[PDB]
Every structure is written in structure tokens, then in C-alpha cells.
Write a protein that binds this ligand. Structure first.
Ligand code: HEM
Ligand code: NA
Ligand SMILES: [Zn+2]
Length: 187
């Protein structure tokens, strides 16, 4: 898990809970004097432990917290990698380019990142079938990231998530409906 994910998580926790809470989280779930260098890899368990702690503190379902983080995370990534996101002029283009363009770039930007396998298929009625697979099973982070991407393009979406690794499948199917964006008028 790359430090950049931890850095954006810090921004979120500091904004919601305060720096005092982040320092508690860091002291408890990470070794002494831990500093997350953006490009460096760290144990994903450190991230999960922190996020689980946050969920418990807020009395929220863990997957709702991960989804919220995902949405916050897209802007964190877009602002740190503006050149990557500026490759796309709309939401649908970006989603279809997650695997072959965005995460391909991430492999050039970072040393041996741990990334999901994603494949998007354009459907009728302005829908996208996004197939997600990963041993980390962060499909709800993916959901959040998609809502973040929609927000980035001033678009509105809905997601159906009825095939899921957490309900026993070896992949998740995220069915994305584009309800509105700047090029969508009546239909
Ligand atoms: C809707 C858009 C996106 C989706 C659905 C998505 C999906 C994901 C997910 C779910 C993860 C967690 C790892 C896993 O599931 O195995 C991940 C990791 C990551 N993604 Fe994306 N992502 C999106 C956009 C971006 C963008 C715009 C960037 C940067 C330009 C980016 C760079 C990264 C990086 C650096 C990691 C961490 C890799 C590691 O820790 O080794 N992603 N992505
Ligand atoms: Na519109
Ligand atoms: Zn899932």
C-alpha cells in the first residue's frame, strides 16, 4: 500500500476528527516515528487497522467508511496526479481508462504498486459494467472513487453492486448508471 494512500487518509482524518486523533491512530497502528513517503510501499494492514479504528470511533459500518474515503481519495489522487486525470474530458472516458491508462501510468510513476484488476464495458442507456478483482477486496473503495470521479466531472451516478467478492464471488460487478453530466440533456 503506497504512502500516498496514507497521506490522503491523513488529510481526511485530520479534517474530520483532528490532528490529535490522527496521531493517536498512527501511534497505535504504526511503528514508532512512522512517516508515509508518498511513493514508498507500506503494509496494507496498517491502513486497514487505522480505517477500522476510525469506523469504530464513528460507529459507522466499515464499508461505508471505506466508501467515503474512496470518494475523498479521488480528489486527493487527482490533485497529486493532475496530468493523469486531465487525460480525460468526461466521466465515462475516465472509467473506461482506469485500467489501461490510469493504473498503467501508476506502474510507471510508482515502483511495483499493488493495484486491482479492472475492466469496463460500455452498456446501453449510458451505463457501464465495471468488473473489479483484487486480493485486497477494496470494491467499496472503488465505489467511492467512482462517486469521486463523477463529482470531479460535475456528473451524477448510481452504482449497483450485486456481485461481490464479499458475498463469495471471485470478482465484483459494479453497474454504473450515468444519470447526468455536461453532455447529457434530456437523455
Ligand atoms: C474511478 C477511478 C479509480 C478507481 C475505481 C480506482 C481503483 C483503485 C482501487 C480500488 C485501489 C485499491 C487497491 C486495490 O483495490 O487492490 C487503487 C489503488 C491505487 N490507485 Fe486507483 N482508482 C481510480 C483512480 C485513480 C487515479 C486517478 C490514480 C492516480 C492518478 C490512481 C492511482 C492509484 C494508486 C497510486 C493506488 C495504490 C497502489 C498501491 O498502494 O500500491 N487511481 N485504485
Ligand atoms: Na446535463
Ligand atoms: Zn464488491
Amino acid at each position: 500500500m503506497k504512502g500516498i494512500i496514507f497521506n490522503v487518509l491523513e488529510d481526511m482524518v485530520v479534517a474530520q476528527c483532528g490532528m490529535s486523533v490522527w496521531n493517536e491512530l498512527l501511534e497505535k497502528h504504526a511503528p514508532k516515528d512512522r512517516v508515509y513517503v508518498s511513493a514508498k510501499s507500506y503494509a496494507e494492514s496498517e491502513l486497514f487497522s487505522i480505517v477500522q479504528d476510525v469506523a469504530q470511533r464513528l460507529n459507522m459500518p466499515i464499508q461505508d467508511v471505506v466508501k467515503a474515503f474512496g470518494q475523498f481519495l479521488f480528489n486527493g489522487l487527482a490533485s497529486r496526479h493532475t496530468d493523469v486525470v486531465d487525460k480525460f474530458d468526461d466521466f465515462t472516458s475516465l472509467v473506461m481508462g482506469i485500467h489501461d491508462v490510469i493504473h498503467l501510468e501508476v506502474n510507471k510513476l510508482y515502483h511495483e504498486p499493488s493495484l486491482p484488476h479492472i475492466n469496463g464495458q460500455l452498456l446501453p442507456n449510458n451505463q457501464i459494467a465495471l468488473r473489479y478483482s483484487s486480493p485486497r477486496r477494496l470494491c467499496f473503495c472503488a465505489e467511492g472513487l467512482l462517486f469521486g470521479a463523477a463529482q470531479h466531472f460535475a456528473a451524477a451516478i448510481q452504482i449497483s453492486h450485486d456481485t461481490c467478492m464479499h458475498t463469495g464471488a471471485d470478482h465484483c460487478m459494479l453497474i454504473i448508471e450515468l444519470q447526468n453530466d455536461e453532455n447529457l440533456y434530456f437523455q
